[model samples]
Target: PEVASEAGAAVADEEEANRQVIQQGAAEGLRTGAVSRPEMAQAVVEADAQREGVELKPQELKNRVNEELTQMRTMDNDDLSRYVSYALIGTGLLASAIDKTGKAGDMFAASYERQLDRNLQAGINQQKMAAAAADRQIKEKDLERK
Candidate 1:
């Protein structure tokens, strides 16, 4: 009976050990599927690059960021204002070029017509004022001698 009990105990211990080893192996396998360490994370990044068909190195990316950051840091309000001015001038030139296309000439002509209309209206207003003044004549008419 003693020998039988001892054998049973040994069997139980062996089974538990086997179960523990299996669990440990599973945990390690799962860990391998993730970036559990720096090297693993680096491998993940490389794999992503390969999968995406691009191979830019980590340092190259960093350098580009640094370059852009430096450029942005150096730009002041004056530089930005100048860039905007250049853009405005370029737009004006483009508009002028478009105006010569005949198809767009009407748009430019419309603006010119609008200015001419304003001038005509101003002249009309001046003539109206002059006529009104003439109609009023000098209230102190010293009777125009005959």
Candidate 2:
């Protein structure tokens, strides 16, 4: 296969770790996915380039984010039949470059929903963990109270 480009093999592991960290942040009531969203598109690119072991100045990261943002916005408009992509692009993702099937809208939709899922579902898991921790603490406190 190739390297770096879509013609090559891409790493999904980093993407998953990023999502997990974002999900954990979201669960902790922080804006996890917000970096992938518009206000922080640079962070998204920074994230990718960082893991890829590529060195880029801040300007370059912003450039890539802006470029990705432009394509996502334009692609969603061009493929209006796919509703979720608008929101996905709204999330400030860079999936447009991940694949160029021409039916890239489908890719956008799945990516958006799943990313959104990352923002949501893991918070639930985090809550379970936190709640369990609290419950244990509560039991300990009650025992001490007696």
Candidate 3:
């Protein structure tokens, strides 16, 4: 597999650093709903473009990621979640097509289903973690109060 070029690595780095923010932030911007498959696919394209210095604008990437995350938070299907997970992890092949335009977009879009599925599963995991922590705290507090 091609190691991500400098720009590609930078984009991936920024995204990984910011994913938690996207995962936990408010839904004010994404009020419409969980981003559709098309939007998530576009984000992948934009990330690729940015890493290659292809000039798609940073705010655009930021907005797209936010929208995609929003959709992920509320999306409610098991199958789609699985698909998104696959797309998110399999981005290596798409590194060069980031800014090619036309069919590249469609080709990049192939991972759409998998990406969305992953985001949904991420949210579920987050919820479970929160619940487990809260349960532990509750039990401890009950002991203390006694």
Clashing pairs in 1: none
Error of 3 at 105 (Å): 32
Off by more than 4 A, model 2: 1-36, 74-146
- lDDT (0 to 1) per candidate: 0.44, 0.50, 0.53
Off by over 4 Å in 1: 34-146
The total of clashing pairs for model 2 equals: 0
RMSD of 2: 13.1
- lDDT at 132, model 2: 80
**Model 2, span 50-138: residue lDDT tens:** 66688998777777978867755664322321322222223322454554443334544666688678757766753465678889999
Pairs that collide, model 2: none
For model 1, how does the per-residue alpha-carbon lDDT over 105-132 read when each residue is reduced to its tens digit?
Answer: 3444564477579757876753455766
Per-residue error for 111 in candidate 3, Å, reads 26
For model 3 the local lDDT of residue 87 reads: 41
Positional deviation of residue 42's Cα in model 2 after best superposition, in angstroms: 1.4
- Give the winner by lDDT: 3
Model 3: how far residue 141 lies from native, Å: 22
Best by TM-score: 2
Error of 2 at 115 (Å): 11
TM-score of every model? Answer: 0.20, 0.29, 0.24
